[PDB]
């Protein structure tokens, strides 16, 4: 039973870590979207020129 308890704690810690990695990934996605907007602005600048 004690061994089972240790395994349960390990699984819980893994779940929490994965939840935090989700936040990191979505921040990266937002940065990439802002990069796309930056490229579009560059194209508009060339058009204006």
């Amino acid at each position: 039973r004690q061994e089972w308890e240790i395994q349960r704690d390990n699984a819980d810690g893994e779940v929490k870590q994965m939840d935090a990695q989700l936040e990191s990934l979505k921040i990266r996605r937002e940065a990439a979207q802002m990069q796309v907007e930056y490229q579009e602005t560059q194209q508009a600048h060339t058009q204006a020129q």
């Binding site: 004690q2 308890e5 240790i6 704690d9 390990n10 810690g13 893994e14």
Partner: protein
Amino acid sequence: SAQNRLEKYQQLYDEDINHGEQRAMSLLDAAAGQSLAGQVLSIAEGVAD
């Protein structure tokens, strides 16, 4: 998570043998002694019969 694992395993290592296992080993020793104790009575019965 890693710190929790370390604490659990350190506690288990420090505890070592609990009381139930000690009692079981003492019981086995006592059983061996009681089994050995009957030889003199058996020989006495043989010589008396």
